[PDB]
Design an enzyme around this catalytic site. Structure first.
Site, short mmCIF file in Angstrom:
data_model
loop_
_atom_site.label_atom_id
_atom_site.label_comp_id
_atom_site.label_asym_id
_atom_site.label_seq_id
_atom_site.Cartn_x
_atom_site.Cartn_y
_atom_site.Cartn_z
N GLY A 144 0.76 -1.17 -0.12
CA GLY A 144 -0.10 0.21 0.24
C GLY A 144 0.86 1.31 -0.01
O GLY A 144 0.91 2.07 -1.03
N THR A 145 1.52 1.40 0.97
CA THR A 145 2.33 2.68 1.11
C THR A 145 3.75 2.31 0.40
O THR A 145 4.51 3.46 -0.38
CB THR A 145 2.85 2.95 2.69
N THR A 179 1.77 -12.79 -1.80
CA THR A 179 1.40 -12.68 -0.55
C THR A 179 0.25 -11.39 -0.10
O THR A 179 -0.33 -11.05 0.86
CB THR A 179 2.43 -12.17 0.32
N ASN A 206 10.82 -11.51 -5.21
CA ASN A 206 11.00 -12.74 -4.18
C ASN A 206 11.24 -13.82 -4.53
O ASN A 206 12.06 -14.86 -4.05
CB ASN A 206 10.42 -12.41 -3.13
N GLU A 254 25.93 7.91 -15.09
CA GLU A 254 26.67 6.97 -15.87
C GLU A 254 25.73 5.91 -16.31
O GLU A 254 25.41 5.64 -17.43
CB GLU A 254 27.94 6.77 -15.25
N1 GTP Z 1 12.54 -8.46 -0.86
C1 GTP Z 1 11.64 -8.07 0.22
N2 GTP Z 1 10.60 -8.20 0.01
C2 GTP Z 1 9.57 -7.84 0.95
C3 GTP Z 1 10.07 -7.83 2.16
N3 GTP Z 1 9.06 -7.51 2.99
C4 GTP Z 1 7.85 -7.43 2.17
N4 GTP Z 1 8.18 -7.58 0.99
C5 GTP Z 1 7.41 -7.55 -0.22
O1 GTP Z 1 6.01 -6.66 0.09
C6 GTP Z 1 5.05 -7.61 -0.12
C7 GTP Z 1 4.13 -7.19 1.07
O2 GTP Z 1 3.61 -5.93 0.96
P1 GTP Z 1 4.67 -4.68 1.74
O3 GTP Z 1 5.75 -4.08 0.86
O4 GTP Z 1 4.85 -5.22 3.13
O5 GTP Z 1 3.45 -3.41 1.94
P2 GTP Z 1 3.87 -2.00 2.64
O6 GTP Z 1 4.85 -1.52 1.69
O7 GTP Z 1 4.34 -2.27 4.28
O8 GTP Z 1 2.47 -1.13 2.51
P3 GTP Z 1 1.31 -1.53 3.20
O9 GTP Z 1 0.61 -2.78 2.66
O10 GTP Z 1 0.39 -0.56 3.31
O11 GTP Z 1 1.63 -1.82 4.81
C8 GTP Z 1 5.61 -8.85 -0.12
O12 GTP Z 1 4.54 -9.51 -1.14
C9 GTP Z 1 6.84 -8.90 -0.57
O13 GTP Z 1 7.07 -9.26 -1.94
C10 GTP Z 1 11.35 -7.81 2.59
O14 GTP Z 1 11.82 -7.76 3.62
N5 GTP Z 1 12.30 -8.24 1.67
#
Ligand code: GTP
Ligand code: GTP
Ligand code: GDP
Ligand code: GDP
Ligand code: MG
Ligand code: MG
Ligand code: ZN
Ligand code: ZN
Lengths: 439, 54, 100, 429, 439, 429
Positions: A144-145, A179, A206, A254
């Site tokens: 979301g964010t 997820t 991921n 670059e």
């Molecule tokens: N590579 C990597 N990807 C992550 C990690 N944590 C979350 N993600 C990615 O983020 C997705 C989950 O949504 P988030 O990015 O956590 O959402 P958010 O940016 O916190 O925003 P909100 O959903 O509003 O809380 C997952 O499907 C992952 O692919 C991390 O620690 N490493």
């Protein structure tokens, strides 16, 4: 001089930044608390740390980065973690309510009322920096964010900071595993800003990172920590050219101009090698040719897309360690002969080379083996259209019945925005296909 | 920890004694680390001075 | 004939054409071809031959059928992923894209 | 980020008592109120469910409601009963009479003002209210009627706030009420209109899961409420504790509700095993997923194989590997395409909390927006229609001034709910 | 330079490769740990191991080998055996379920889920070799994996490596000793790969080795370990010319050209002498003429086929030790003199000789005895048509009433495959008889 | 390479209990599941039959089936009964009544829901399921009915997976049931289609082996089950332990089944000798092969001398090379050419394992697809027709939903199998 302001958005961006900073502090000799030893007047004799840290009015080092999250759990963990004293108490912007995997919530309601405070902190960082090379954004388009608020932040950065380079490292929905259910919507909507208000965007899915860890790092049960460690290794490999002495210095501008042929075509696929476990490492002679072949092989790829199904357009190879022009040119010559990889007819050169003398560092508890040399590719290729096709086909399936659109409407966006996002992704596939076409 | 180290040493000992006494494979019987009991001639071999690369 | 060939036995003995790899795997491609970029969901155990044959088209490729008796032949289409069960509507595809 | 809870009626109060038992145990809070934990994480986000008092006590943000006062001595007689504020106890002389009309229009109305005053007190003291939670049973008088009235007034001043409702749908086989269909039908439309999401807990299913899976000989009402309490503790785990992939009530609502009227879910908890079978179980995700997606684990007596999963949510708690918690879901989506709706790909949302429930190394709570939710509404709808056709037990509802039309209106709304579930189940790409 | 890649297929292949690699390690003084502690006789950084062992940054000598088997029994026991450190964790890959003596299953269903990784590992091995001589594939066609997956691997290697040398050490079903019942089906179906994609196919059937060991090594009970040690001795005798110095050095293509007269007349029998016991050895003066005569006798031969029923077409002799070329010249003269063995009329010379200085290395605790000189013959002769005319007769008897064909046709293989293989084999006996016929 | 096991009826339950006794003894497992072996080769492939709990206890992957809970109680109270999962026992209120109709259509068909639930749980928990295992008796009601129903509904879900059945073929010489031919006929035609290979057990031959070879004064069901258990453990010797010449269940099927319908084998074990002659017997592999091909040593009551061996399989275990496992096979092939088949060269496959059963330094298990296996099918055929012509004992079957058409089809299918066996026996090259 040569500063690069790092930005972390969402949980994914914040944790990736945590794993990046545990590496940067260790590589430039900054303690996790950030202060110097009591007997030493100056903690670090050189100022190679300048690009990532700024020394303070007590002598200790605060990083040149901002964390930004609409929910307080991750930022409060950072506050209560082992880097409680390294990070500024500000520049760690926290909201009282997350975006709930909703691009509309992150972009139009919750994002707008915190984005200006974030830009105030970013402006203080930029005022501190005297030779700002650009911005180093880390987030995930599936959140979301991470998607909506990151998009808004990128738009404000573009309007307020001129043409300054804005490199982005974003975690995309995987072809197999996800997820979230509204993740295609979030990715499609974030591709708006990521298609107009960023210079070069890096795929960091991921699924391919998990496959990398499983087949190579020999981790039977890897996690976000290992994934973020690999991401931090990639980022350090990209940025180390301006921090350490090297044969072929490469900067942000670059490798953002030697990478993208058209303003719309700026989504690149990146790979890192030799990613090998400790057991693997002392069994193979990790030569320059071997690591280059592993990089060009889809096995070492960090994005779940097969480059053999497209055409390469621009590969920037950042070598680190005891690599030599005696061998990198030979590896390039013998890899251009290989016919799995194949370039568009209008870009015969297609290769940028940046050689750095500093080998990669080792993080305690990490699964990365100590390698004498390494190489990271940043490759713009037409094979990236596959993931876009998959993601907006999922968008079409989810959008035919107008599913989950009520959440975005309740968080303040038009359905014309969904329509325009789908049309622009279709146009993106169309001109990917056009530039992949021959003359 | 101390208990974990003792358990690890016990597993290493078990791995070593896997093939001691009426539980042993043909590979274990006919494939040992007896490299110190072999007298091998090593005065004939290619010196391999001339090589190429690309 | 009197000596059955690789084409007789079902395996390609020639280098595949690589333009079939150059061609992008676009949603336009799926709309014109019939199918979706969505990966096939097969009722299979992970890491099995049944899953691989259900998800990849290089696993079930067979060059020709039987003996040839009963500008050469080239392949290169079996490399990729099996197509989804859904069909891509044309209205979701753009005819033109903004580029130079 | 912090939510305020309300328990309505006899069933709701008794469920909430043990829910607060679980919450206080998980946060290291004494039955009296003092903090006796051994970790910083317990106190880190204790404001989510508790408020700090003058003397360091931790009072639950809970509003207790019942028209029957004869059963609100038990809620304070429970082991954690002395945790609540005395002024959050709201009582009436006579009971609801098992009458939705009495609980919603005549007796509940005279009692709803003080309840809303307490709720507004809690909300104003609250810094950033994440939502209102409600625990009640639709088969009763002051649980269904007063609970629906409470949520209806709550929407009037907190529209965007998350309205959790753990509604207890009564079952025909474990039935102990004859005005059961009347109360359930009169409350279902109010639940649809005035609840962001509403999970259905069925007493028959609770009895079955305690009888077969737990195999324990005597699961009473307390043992039935234990599972509901565990599910409530696990649905808000990521608000109170850090995790690899955290979430909150709004985020689950966004990832589980595709259309505004489709907000009825199935609850499941894992692991649940008998005393005898305890040595024989492996504690991993490759066993948690089996129990969670198992038919017998649902706390609703309508087998999820009837229809197709619109959305699923897996709140995992404990020490897990993120790829092993997501590839299990990938495998089930890959191999069970018949029970997942095609036009909504990637139906399962997995979230990770670092800290598991107290006494458990690893667990998971399941939230499923399956189209099988129409089954319970049907099997009570035929009962309601049979009761209504002969005008049975309508004088007990029309003596409070409530007219015979609202029965038909509730029937229409409930049939619309069932019809939209069926249509979305049968929808094709 | 002179590198050679060894690929072992199936349980028989892995069993042979274990003995082959222990014998190679004993040749080159390499411990199972994979190091060279101290050797006064070895010159400074002497590299005669480059053909079979590749240097590693850890100083290790990693074998240029690839072990395959569709089930993990032999693979896992090798991974937990003595040579854990010598062998890479990769390059020693396994499936999960066996082929079950089903050529169709090992060639179309279970072989194809691992052949891709097999080619990947082979390419990784070949990238490290700058002078790759060729590939030696050790397998038994009588099994499922060794037949099906072996044929698939050879077919893919043909197009992946062009005109590189292929040497298939194949264990056919012997006339009497034979394990499986669908073994004739597997042998007949695997005939196309051995006819087309294998440049030279050497015979290593079990019954002849059993007879040789019982009659000449004077041990009542040899085993698979003993026959694999003999096979490894044969392979080492073949590769000694390109490993160590010698008066007459011959390479893989060097004996390929001399041994293959016609495009697919490349199925060659094997013999080795003097095979000798510890008690036998130190009482005889093993002259070169005597050992050559013992080789040409049909009792010291590793293939159960009597040469008196055929015409000798081309014999390649590999001598090791203190052999002077005059001894082999007199051996050739007396062989041409003696009548009970007859050469084909159109091949007057019919003889290739390669002398290597280093003698065979005895393996104490095994079965062989130290000898000052040895010789291995690889012979193309028309007498090899007898084993084909027996295996195809067994195939016809089995296939007359469609016995055991449902297993093959249920694995995605057409019914006409059996007929095609039978016709190809029949043409094999036909042109063997044709080339054996006098002008 | 997982094998998930099941037991049907009291006969099958006792046989499986003894089989798990033997397997646990071989792998060093107490009745409490703890491991006390002398080598790690047990834990190397312990997964093939056992699963490890997160606490380290090894639990058999077995599913128990009986409509009588008394059999479950007896098995649980047995010496090794605490090994199995408490929820892996499945029981009914009323027994099969020794009726194939009750065990296959009315009472058994009801309980197969839970049977399949637990069976699918166990089968999926396998990393790579090599096959299913079943032990039952075709002369009973639960084993003959529920066992065939389970194999039928498991073939539909796992088509290519290997299907072991050990069916105790009853004989009139040891007759103890009068619906014996009815049940046998109704189960044979199901096993023909639903089992990829299946070897038969006759209590007549087990008793004869115990009396003349073991010379036991009072042989018991425990002794017969121990023999069957030892040989059923030996059939998976290459699966569970490393060997010189490995083999699997699919390999056995491929090398023992020439045509899909001909998969009924006759089987045996070696070495076997009396208590008073153990020290006098010179255990050489030639003697092993002599006893292996001895007619009296076969544990299915039909003399091979009246038929010919389609195929044979000899799974040898112990320190031993390949010529004692192939050259005496050549010897028996040459000197009993009348006892073998001309159009199948190399009738006998040999497999070698490096770990012999404990208490012995080498052993062998024999599995033979002899064409004489159809003699029992003959005799059961006219036995069935004897009551079928007079419609005797048929009302019990017809009152449970079955019809005379099913009986006619079953007899026709059995006769077709018999005719195929006879025609392949007397077929000429
Ligand atoms: N590579 C990597 N990807 C992550 C990690 N944590 C979350 N993600 C990615 O983020 C997705 C989950 O949504 P988030 O990015 O956590 O959402 P958010 O940016 O916190 O925003 P909100 O959903 O509003 O809380 C997952 O499907 C992952 O692919 C991390 O620690 N490493
Ligand atoms: N020379 C030699 N041959 C062996 C050895 N082990 C097995 N074989 C041969 O393998 C044949 C049996 O084939 P299989 O048992 O199926 O073994 P495979 O060929 O590797 O194929 P699979 O094991 O089924 O995957 C026998 O006839 C032997 O000739 C060995 O150690 N040495
Ligand atoms: N699971 C559970 N169900 C309960 C409990 N108490 C009551 N019920 C159910 O609720 C119904 C009675 O509703 P009631 O509590 O009297 O409603 P109220 O009058 O509004 O408080 C009965 O059919 C019970 O099945 C409880 O503690 N746990
Ligand atoms: N080998 C062996 N056979 C048994 C045992 N118990 C019963 N049987 C055989 O099983 C047959 C009867 O099976 P039955 O009890 O009716 O099976 P059920 O109806 O499914 O329980 C008899 O002919 C016995 O010979 C045992 O412990 N071992
Ligand atoms: Mg978040
Ligand atoms: Mg094998
Ligand atoms: Zn042909
Ligand atoms: Zn699609």
């Amino acid at each position: 001089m040569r500063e690069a302001i790092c930005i972390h958005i969402g949980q994914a961006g914040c944790q990736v930044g945590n794993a990046c900073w545990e590496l940067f502090c260790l590589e430039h000799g900054i303690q996790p608390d950030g202060s110097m030893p009591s007997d030493k007047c100056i903690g670090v004799e050189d100022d190679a740390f300048n690009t990532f840290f700024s020394e303070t009015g007590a002598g200790k080092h605060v990083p040149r980065c901002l964390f930004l999250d609409l929910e307080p759990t991750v930022v409060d963990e950072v506050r209560t973690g082992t880097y409680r004293q390294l990070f500024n108490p500000e520049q760690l912007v926290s909201g009282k309510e997350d975006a709930a995997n909703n691009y509309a919530r992150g972009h139009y309601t919750i994002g707008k009322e915190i984005v200006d405070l974030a830009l105030d902190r970013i402006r203080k960082l930029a005022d501190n920096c005297t030779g700002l090379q650009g911005f180093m954004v880390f987030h995930a388009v599936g959140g979301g964010t991470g998607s909506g608020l990151g998009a808004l932040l990128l738009e404000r950065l573009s309007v307020d900071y001129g043409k300054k380079s804005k490199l982005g490292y974003t975690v995309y929905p995987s072809p197999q595993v996800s997820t979230a259910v509204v993740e295609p919507y979030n990715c499609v909507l974030s591709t708006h800003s990521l298609l107009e208000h960023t210079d070069v965007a890096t795929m960091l899915d991921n699924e391919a990172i998990y496959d990398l860890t499983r087949r190579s790092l020999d981790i039977e049960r890897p996690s976000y920590t290992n994934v973020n460690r690999l991401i931090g290794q990639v980022v350090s490999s990209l940025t180390a050219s301006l921090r350490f002495d090297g044969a072929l210095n490469v900067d942000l501008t670059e490798f953002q101009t030697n990478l993208v042929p058209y303003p719309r075509i700026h989504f690149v696929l990146t790979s890192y090698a030799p990613v090998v476990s400790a057991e693997k490492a002392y069994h193979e002679q990790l030569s320059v040719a071997d690591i280059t072949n592993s990089v060009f092989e889809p096995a070492g790829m960090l994005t779940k897309c097969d480059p053999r199904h497209g055409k390469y357009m621009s590969c920037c190879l950042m070598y680190r360690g005891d690599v030599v022009p005696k061998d990198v040119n030979a590896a390039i010559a013998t890899i251009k002969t290989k016919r799995t990889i194949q370039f568009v007819d209008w870009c015969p050169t297609g290769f940028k080379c940046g050689i750095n003398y500093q080998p990669p560092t080792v993080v305690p508890g990490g699964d990365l083996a100590k390698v004498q040399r390494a190489v990271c590719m940043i490759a713009n290729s037409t094979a990236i259209a596959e993931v876009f096709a998959r993601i907006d086909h999922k968008f079409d399936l989810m959008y035919s019945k107008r599913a989950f659109v009520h959440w975005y409407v309740g968080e303040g966006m038009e359905e014309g925005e969904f329509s325009e996002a789908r049309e622009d992704l279709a146009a993106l596939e169309k001109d990917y296909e056009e530039v992949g076409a021959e003359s | 920890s101390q208990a974990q180290e003792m358990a690890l040493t016990q597993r290493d000992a078990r791995f070593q004694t896997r093939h001691d006494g009426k539980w042993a494979t043909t590979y274990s019987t006919g494939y040992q680390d007896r490299s110190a009991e072999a007298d091998v001639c090593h005065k004939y071999g290619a010196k391999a001075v001339f090589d190429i690369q690309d | 004939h009197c000596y059955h060939k690789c084409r007789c036995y079902g395996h390609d003995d020639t280098l595949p054409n690589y333009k079939l790899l150059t061609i992008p795997r676009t949603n336009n491609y799926y709309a014109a071809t019939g199918g979706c970029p969505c990966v096939p969901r097969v009722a299979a155990h992970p890491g099995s031959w049944r899953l691989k044959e259900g998800q990849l088209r290089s696993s079930t490729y067979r060059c020709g059928t039987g003996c040839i008796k009963k500008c050469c032949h080239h392949s290169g289409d079996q490399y990729g992923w099996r197509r989804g069960p859904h069909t891509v509507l044309d209205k979701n595809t753009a005819a033109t894209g903004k580029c130079d | 980020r912090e939510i305020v809870s309300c328990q309505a009626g006899q069933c709701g109060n008794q469920i909430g008592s043990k829910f607060w038992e679980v919450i206080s145990d998980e946060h290291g809070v004494d039955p009296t109120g003092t903090y006796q934990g051994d970790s910083d994480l317990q106190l880190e986000r204790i404001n989510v469910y508790f408020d700090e008092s003058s003397g360091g006590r931790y009072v639950p943000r809970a509003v207790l409601m019942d028209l029957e006062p004869g059963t609100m001595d038990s809620v304070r007689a429970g082991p954690y009963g002395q945790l609540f504020r005395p002024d959050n106890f709201i009582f009436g002389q006579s009971g609801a009479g098992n009458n939705w009309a009495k609980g919603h229009y005549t007796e509940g109305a005279e009692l709803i003002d003080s309840v809303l005053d307490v709720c507004r007190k809690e909300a104003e003291s609250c810094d950033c209210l994440q939502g209102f939670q409600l625990s009640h049973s639709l088969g009763g008088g002051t649980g269904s009627g007063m609970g629906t009235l409470l949520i209806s007034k709550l929407r009037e001043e907190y529209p965007d706030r998350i309205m959790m409702t753990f509604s207890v749908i009564p079952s025909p086989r474990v039935s102990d009420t004859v005005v059961e269909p009347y109360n359930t039908t009169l409350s279902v439309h109010q639940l649809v209109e005035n609840s962001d999401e509403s999970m259905c807990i069925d007493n028959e299913a609770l009895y079955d899961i305690c009888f077969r899976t737990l195999k324990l000989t005597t699961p009473t009402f307390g043992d039935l409420n234990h599972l509901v309490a565990a599910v409530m503790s696990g649905v808000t785990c990521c608000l109170r504790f850090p995790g690899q992939l955290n979430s909150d009530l709004r985020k689950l609502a966004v990832n589980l509700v595709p259309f505004p009227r489709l907000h009825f879910f199935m609850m499941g908890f894992a692991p649940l095993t008998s005393r005898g079978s305890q040595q024989y179980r492996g504690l991993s995700v490759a066993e948690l997923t089996q129990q969670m997606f198992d038919a017998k684990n649902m706390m609703q007596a309508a087998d999820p194989r009837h229809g197709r999963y619109l959305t699923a949510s897996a709140l995992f708690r404990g020490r897990m590997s993120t790829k092993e918690v997501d590839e299990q879901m990938l495998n089930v989506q890959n191999k069970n395409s018949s029970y997942f709706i095609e036009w909504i790909p990637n139906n399962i949302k997995s979230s990770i909390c670092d800290i598991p429930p107290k006494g458990l190394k690893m667990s998971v709570t399941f939230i499923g927006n399956n189209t099988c939710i129409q089954e319970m509404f049907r099997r009570v709808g035929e009962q309601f229609t049979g009761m209504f056709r002969r005008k049975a037990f309508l004088h007990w509802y029309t003596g409070e001034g409530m007219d015979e039309m609202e029965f038909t209106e509730a029937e229409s709304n409930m049939n619309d709910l069932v019809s939209e579930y069926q249509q979305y189940q049968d929808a094709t790409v």
